[model samples]
Target: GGPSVFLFPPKPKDTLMISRTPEVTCVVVDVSHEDPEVKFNWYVDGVEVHNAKTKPREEQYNSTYRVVSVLTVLHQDWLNGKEYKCKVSNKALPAPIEKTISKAKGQPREPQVYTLPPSRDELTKNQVSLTCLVKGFYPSDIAVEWESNGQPENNYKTTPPVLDSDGSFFLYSKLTVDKSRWQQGNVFSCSVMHEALHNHYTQKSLSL
Candidate 1:
C-alpha cells in the first residue's frame, strides 16, 4: 500500500505562534516495508533547508514501517513570520506530499484588565493589597502601572506572564497600600500598556 504522510502541530488557520525555537515533524506511516531511500524535505519560504534530520522505525508486529523527519530552526526566523514546509516522498508513492505553516500576522491581542479591591480581611489589617488582573493577551510583553490618587506607585509588583490553554497570556500586579488610605476613600488605578490597543494603554480603577 502507498504510504500516508502527516504533519505535526496542525492548526485550523495554518498559523501559529512560537515563543522559542520551533521543531516541526513530518511523519510517513504504513510503508509496506522498511525503505532506506525514503526522502523527507524541509523548506522555509519555499527554499529547501538542508539540516533536517530523519529517523525510521519498524512496527513491532509487522513489516510495516514509519518514518519521521524533524526540522528545527532558530526562534528569530519563526518570529519573523517565515513559512515552513515539509515534503515526504517514498518509492511506493507516485508523488510527494507536503504541508505548510506560518506565523500569525497582525497586532498582538489586547488584554482584558480588571482592578480588584482589597478584601474585607485585608481591609482590617494595617496594609491592604489591591490586585490588577490582566488576562487573555498575546505576545506576552506588557507593562503594568499602579496609581493612587493620581500619584504613580513604585511598590507594586507584577508577575511574569503565564501562557494559557487558549494560546493567550495571563498575569497580575499587586499594589500594597496602607489601610488608612483605603479608609480615606482614595481611588486606586491600574494601567496596562500593550501594542494591541489604539492608545497602547487601558486602565481600570477601584475605590472604597
Candidate 2:
C-alpha cells in the first residue's frame, strides 16, 4: 500500500453543549460547506429520535422550521435534564455538536394532549374495526373504549395517541361479537365519552 494524498482530515469546530428542554429545536446545517455526501445524525438519550435528522438538501420533519437559517441551529423535544445531541459527520469533516440538560424540572408550558378522528371499518363476519381520534394536542396521552347494549365491559384500552403535525392525534380500536339482540336491534355505539364531548359514535350491520 502506498501513501494516498487524497485523504484529508476534518477541521476542528468550536461546538457548544448546554442543558435544557425544548419547546422546539431548529437545527440549521451548512452542509453546502461540506459535500452532499456528508452524513447527519441526531440523538436523545443515546438513542436516535424519530425524524430528528436534518440536511440542507432535505425537508425538515418539523414544518415550523425555517430552512437555511444558520441562526436557527436545532430543535428538540425539550425533555428536562436529558442529554441532546446533534452530530454531523463525513470522511471529509466530522465535527459533531453535543449538548445536555440538567433534568425535566421545568413546568410544562402547555398541557399536552391529542385529539383523534372517529372512524369505522368492517370485517368479513362477526367483527368490526373502529377508531376514535381527537386532534389539536401533543404527546398523545389518552384512553379509548367501545360499548354495546349500554354496558361497560372489559373491552377497551389506555394508550398513547399517534401524533401528527397541527396537533392532530390518532387512536385505533376493534370490536368482535356474535350477532346478538343489540346487533339485531341495530343498536350500538362506538362512543368517545371523555372529559368533554361524551358522544357515542356507533354502527351495526345485518347478520346476513
Candidate 3:
C-alpha cells in the first residue's frame, strides 16, 4: 500500500532545556530507571515544596506558578536565583545526588536591552501598540506594569497576572498609545517588575 495518512511530517515540538525564553522549563532530574513510581523532590528558597503535579516528562519535572493561563512561561530572577538541589532515589536505588542549577548564571551578562513588538516604520507614531514581558527560572512568580513617561499612573497595568508554562516571561503588558499623543510623538513606558532584575527598563520611542 501507498503512504498512509501519517506519512506527512508531524508538527514540530521544542526540545526541553534550561532557558530564559518563552519555552516550558523544567529541571531535567535524571533517574537510573523509568519506574512508574519514581518520585522527584522539589524545593524553593530552601523550603521543601512538594512533588510536581506532572511527571516523567522525558526525564524531567515541571512547575508552574499560580497564574491565569498555561501558555505563560517563567524566567530566572536576577538575585533570587540560587543553587537549590533536586534529588530522586527509591528505597531500593543508589544515593540521591544533590543536583545544582543556576538561574541568574552567577555572573555578569550582556547588558540587558528593551525590545518592542513593532519598528517605527512598521507602525505609525501614537499608533504604537506595544508589550513587555518577564519570567523567573526556579520560582515562576512575576509581575508587570505600564507607565506613562517614567511613573506608574492611572491605567498602570492590565489586571490578572500571567503565569508560567515555560521558563521565560512570567509577566506581560499590552498597551496602545493614544493615536493623537503617539502621532505628536510622546514617550510611554512598559516594564517587568522582576524581584530579581532591579534595573527595569522602558521601550524606545517608535523606531522608524
C-alpha lDDT of all candidate models, in order: 0.76, 0.36, 0.38
User: Candidate 2, residues 51-70: lDDT per residue as tens digits?
Assistant: 64343546335322222211
Q: Per-residue lDDT of 1-208 in model 1, one digit per residue for the tens?
A: 5777777643211222344335767887787654646887888999988998777565636667777887776655665668889987877778888888765565578899988888888867899899999999876756788886788988899998898898888899999988898788888899887656557678899876
lDDT tens digits, residue span 18-43, model 3: 33333222332332332424445544
**How high is each candidate's TM-score?**
0.50, 0.30, 0.35
Better of 1 and 3 by lDDT: 1
lDDT of 1: 0.76
Which residue segments of model 3 deviate by more than 4 Å? 1-35, 42-81, 90-98, 106-126, 129-145, 149-178, 184-187, 192-208
Candidate 1 clash figure, as a count: 0
Error of 1 at 121 (Å): 1.0
- When 1 and 2 are scored with lDDT, the better candidate is 1
Instruction: Output the better candidate (1/3) by TM-score.
Output: 1
State which candidate has the highest lDDT: 1
- Number of clashes in model 2? 23
Worst 10 residues of 1 by lDDT: 10-19
| Candidate 1 residue-wise lDDT at 67 | 76
